[PDB]
Design a protein around this ligand. Structure first.
Ligand SMILES: Nc1ncnc2c1ncn2[C@@H]1O[C@H](COP(=O)(O)OP(=O)(O)OC[C@H]2O[C@H](O)[C@H](O)[C@@H]2O)[C@@H](O)[C@H]1O
Lengths: 473, 418, 51
DNA sequence: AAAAAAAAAAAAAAAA
RNA sequence: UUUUUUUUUUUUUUUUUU
């Protein structure tokens, strides 16, 4: 018979300096932090794709109604929520003829066809960037669906429809957004199914991706993503402490070189002089040899921690007082020793491990609903279970769909206040710019770090990668 | 008739808040008058203010801040509002609004000192909601208008209808606490009595080979059948350790370390629980790492233990509920139980298509909430139970561990309702 | 000084002789575009560094 | 050629 | 890849024992 403590739901900042726990509702009524006077849109694609994009944009200019408003709030419209202008006029459109996209697609080699498709769009995007007077804030790339069946690993191109690079990932999304880092072009890829799906139909006659009740959140997350990629700040945290830098480390496998080489990626989140929250990447990827180490060598640890520390000094000036390092994998002693050496005397280094594999499943006594999100069971001063995934009353449903699994938080290194540690990751679960959801199941550091890891292992010729998330998510 | 709400305010500074409030109220179907948005340009502005306040202003709203307290125009229109209040006999005609944290209630103007002020200082949402109660309770006229955007925004304001409430609630985990352990874990020096190229997995009772010793919770001579040579083993070679000390963590030396002596208990518990499924005659499906155990169709009386149905049919696919057990000792001595769903073609042979099994599991679990998982897990625990409150996992002829049939219960100080 | 010049060009400005060099009526007046002093992304360069 | 306690990459579906 | 989440598959690694 054990006690579990509840930690207060975080509130995120909006326009006029006022706070709100919900993000979609908060920006729906209060407005974003900064003004993006206008959004200059660039679209690459074919004829039958641009029409659907224009139709969807016209749809989302007007309000869209959801079936059950308690679970999913009303969408007032892009101009209503973000007070920014972004219409169908001014779209810099680039052609991709159906025959041309067909020639490369019907290729026996998946890697070769993927590289050809990536190059075809990327060269046109580069040309539009360099040899034209028009300025494009964000480049929407739309691709057909047969491409979506036959442009990733383990996709067997049907034999009757075969007509006719290995150092690149066969995933179209990662390769595309990887080779574009040298030119700093904000890009966001569309599937045509993600677009006005009603044209796409299955055998039963209903649309295969029926979003009849969930058109609202589709618009919510696409509009928020477009606003973020164009340089806007949708929301900001309110409980961020001064002198706290976080970092979120993740490890990813690379298939190009012999041995995975385990590329590591990090994402920063820290306060700045004033109230501006600096939430950028920490991208100096330090490749870690050996098949299954996931523990990083001392020299790379020193380099990563220093490059983080000047990434704080150049904007705030002085040494951090407490650093709370997060990662999916456990920390052994030798990397922490290297970290400590770079860490200055007043700085309090904290190494926290995060894992979802622990099989804890709290079933409440009665009720067709799960435990309420925010509940935390403290095993001891070093370790605890925090239900970052669960029910939150405002959204009328649980953030989980089956019975949720809590998050296992252990302060592997350092001392840390475990209650304070739990009081910070649940705040980090709110900064999901890529999706307009109430909260995310994992902290955004370890999520955007995962994304930047997944994007950089597609191309091996990246040098000095951008640290802006708009080029990645 | 009077169907306008006038928002007095300090024009040089407070335009932003007033514009926001006016837009919100117009969206909410309430007619709104203010200088920034509704004043007609190139007109006698004071005369229009007098006309609207005296004639059509049903409700008066003052935005009070550090500026608006000493502004002349707000004072004049405030006096006119007081006069028309005296004319109308309505004490709720005027509702001042507090915007500035710095404007203490001590220094606010006297005629609004007498008045109660709706707070906007901390949040602009609670204050707007309080305006909403103030307007329906005093019955301020409201045009329904679009009747869809209006009521949708009205609901969107109250983010407040479902908040955390302080109420005790109990939670039943998927963990089974280990009530007791055998007195000692034994380290027999079998040596050449146990053949080197032999497998301890087919042995009657759980046992792990560590160094040159056999580690188990059984008696020394409980393995005579599979190890006939062990008939002449000497019990003085036993390396009994006080198991409770290992659970505490007190015992640690060259022979065994705390780190590995807890890994040598969870494996024994795992093998004992596997043998327990084998004893209960439940069927096995190989998962990626573990092996889950399910019940056949017809083995149970009408395929339902207690009052919940555990084996069923959709079309041709027979679905079976299954549980997998894993032993850990970090939080407590615990056997965690995870739930799984499997599918068969005739109720006996598991479908070999992994994609078919995954899709079938998704289609079934599409509509099972908490009371569909918890009750079935508990029913399976009761079926594996030997008595009313617990069952036993056996590692020896006389040594057993009692595993309670009820899950580890927690308590929540916060709850909610549908 | 940049902010001041932007503020000046926000308002109309007059040349000495209007018929020769026409007056500038305001940035939004001519280009129908929003470009204000609020929202400039500034990148500091200290004097010691250029010295 | 095992074990348990940790690791990632992929596919399928239904939810927001 | 608009997302999120829960599963299902493999594969791998470490520490120890022969
Ligand atoms: N021809 C004009 N003459 C005077 N003021 C003008 C004129 N045109 C615009 N204004 C603007 O009119 C404003 C005069 O406001 P103020 O007396 O200074 O300070 P308050 O806080 O007490 O004004 C609050 C009320 O008085 C307002 O009229 C509204 O009706 C308010 O409800 C100035 O900003 C002028 O720029």
């Amino acid at each position: 018979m054990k006690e579990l403590i509840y930690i207060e739901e975080p509130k995120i900042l909006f326009a006029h300096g006022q706070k709100c726990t919900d993000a979609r509702d908060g920006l729906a009524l209060f407005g974003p932090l900064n003004n993006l006077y206008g959004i200059k849109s660039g679209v690459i694609g074919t004829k039958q794709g641009l029409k659907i994009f224009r139709d969807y944009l016209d749809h989302i200019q007007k309000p869209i109604y959801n079936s059950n408003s308690i679970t999913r709030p009303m969408f007032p419209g892009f101009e209503a929520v973000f007070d920014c202008k972004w219409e169908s006029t001014g779209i810099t459109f680039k052609e991709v003829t159906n025959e041309d996209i067909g020639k490369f697609l019907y290729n026996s080699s998946t890697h070769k066809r993927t590289y050809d498709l990536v190059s075809l769009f990327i060269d046109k995007i580069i040309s539009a960037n360099k040899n034209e007077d028009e300025n494009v804030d964000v480049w929407f790339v739309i691709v057909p669906d047969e491409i979506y069946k036959y442009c990733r690993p383990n996709s067997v191109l049907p034999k009757e429809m075969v007509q006719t690079t290995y150092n690149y990932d066969a995933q179209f999304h990662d390769q595309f957004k990887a080779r574009l880092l040298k030119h700093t072009i904000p890009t966001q890829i569309f599937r045509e199914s993600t677009l006005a799906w009603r044209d796409f139909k299955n055998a039963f006659g209903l649309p295969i991706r029926d979003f009849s009740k969930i058109e609202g959140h589709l618009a919510w997350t696409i509009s928020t993503a477009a606003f973020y990629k164009a340089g806007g700040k949708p929301w900001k945290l309110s409980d961020v402490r001064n002198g706290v830098c976080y970092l979120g480390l993740v490890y990813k496998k690379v298939e190009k070189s012999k041995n995975p080489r385990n590329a590591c990626c990090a994402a920063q989140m820290f306060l700045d002089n004033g109230d501006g929250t600096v939430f950028k990447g920490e991208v100096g990827p330090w490749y870690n040899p050996k098949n299954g180490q996931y523990h990083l060598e001392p020299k790379e640890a020193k380099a990563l921690l220093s490059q983080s520390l000047q990434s704080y000094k150049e904007q705030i000036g002085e040494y951090p007082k407490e650093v709370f390092i997060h990662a999916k994998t456990r920390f052994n002693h030798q990397e922490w020793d290297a970290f400590l050496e770079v860490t200055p005397k007043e700085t309090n280094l904290v190494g926290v491990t995060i894992s979802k594999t622990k099989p804890l499943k709290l079933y409440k006594t009665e009720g067709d609903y799960t435990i309420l999100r925010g509940n935390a069971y403290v095993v001891n001063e070093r370790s605890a279970f925090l239900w970052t995934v669960g029910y939150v009353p405002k959204i009328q449903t649980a953030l989980s769909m089956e019975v949720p699994n809590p998050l296992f938080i252990e302060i592997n290194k350092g001392e840390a206040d475990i209650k304070q540690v739990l009081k910070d990751i649940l705040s980090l679960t709110k900064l999901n710019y890529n999706a307009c959801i109430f909260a995310d199941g994992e902290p955004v550091t370890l999520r955007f770090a995962d994304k930047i890891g997944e994007i950089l292992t597609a191309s091996t010729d990246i040098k000095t990668p951008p640290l802006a998330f708009k080029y990645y998510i | 008739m009077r169907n306008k709400i006038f928002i007095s305010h300090a024009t040089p500074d407070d335009n932003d808040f007033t514009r926001w409030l006016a837009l919100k109220l117009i969206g909410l179907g309430y007619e709104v008058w203010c200088d920034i948005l509704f004043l007609d340009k190139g007109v006698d502005f004071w005369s229009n203010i007098e006309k609207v306040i005296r004639e059509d202003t049903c409700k008066f709203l003052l935005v009070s801040s550090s500026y608006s307290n000493q502004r002349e125009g707000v004072l004049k229109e405030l006096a006119v509002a007081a006069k028309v209040k005296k004319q109308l006999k309505d004490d709720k005609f005027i509702i001042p609004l507090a915007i500035d944290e710095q404007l203490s209630y001590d220094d606010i103007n006297i005629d609004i000192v007498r008045l109660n002020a709706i707070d906007f200082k901390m949040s602009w949402a609670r204050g707007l909601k309080d305006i909403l109660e103030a307007f329906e309770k005093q019955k301020v006229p409201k045009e329904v208008a679009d009747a869809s955007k209006s009521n949708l925004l009205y609901q969107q304001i109250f983010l407040h209808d479902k908040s955390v409430i302080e109420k005790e609630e109990i939670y039943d985990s998927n963990w089974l606490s280990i009530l007791s352990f055998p007195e000692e874990l034994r380290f027999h020096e079998y040596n050449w009595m146990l053949p080197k190229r032999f497998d301890v997995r087919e042995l009657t009772f759980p046992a792990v080979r560590y160094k040159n010793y056999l580690c188990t919770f059984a008696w020394a001579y409980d393995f005579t059948y599979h190890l006939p040579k062990t008939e002449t083993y000497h019990k003085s070679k036993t390396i009994r350790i006080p198991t409770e000390e290992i659970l505490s963590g007190s015992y640690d030396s060259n022979f065994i370390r705390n780190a590995e002596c807890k890994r040598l208990i969870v494996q024994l518990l795992n093998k004992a629980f596997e043998l327990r499924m084998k004893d209960k005659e439940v069927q096995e499906y190989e998962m990626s790492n573990k092996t889950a155990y399910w019940l056949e169709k017809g083995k149970l009386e009408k395929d339902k233990f207690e009052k919940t149905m555990l084996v069923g049919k959709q079309k041709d696919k027979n679905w079976h509920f299954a549980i997998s057990g894993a032993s850990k000792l970090y939080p407590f001595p615990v056997l965690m139980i995870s739930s799984h769903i499997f599918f068969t073609a005739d109720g006996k042979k598991l479908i070999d298509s992994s994609s078919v099994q995954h899709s079938s599991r998704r289609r079934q679990g599409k509509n099972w909430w908490n009371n569909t998982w918890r009750t079935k897990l508990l029913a399976f625990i009761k079926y594996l139970s030997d008595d009313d409150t617990s069952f036993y996992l056996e590692m020896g002829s006389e040594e057993k561990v009692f595993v309670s049939n009820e899950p580890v219960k927690f308590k929540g100080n916060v709850s909610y309702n549908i």
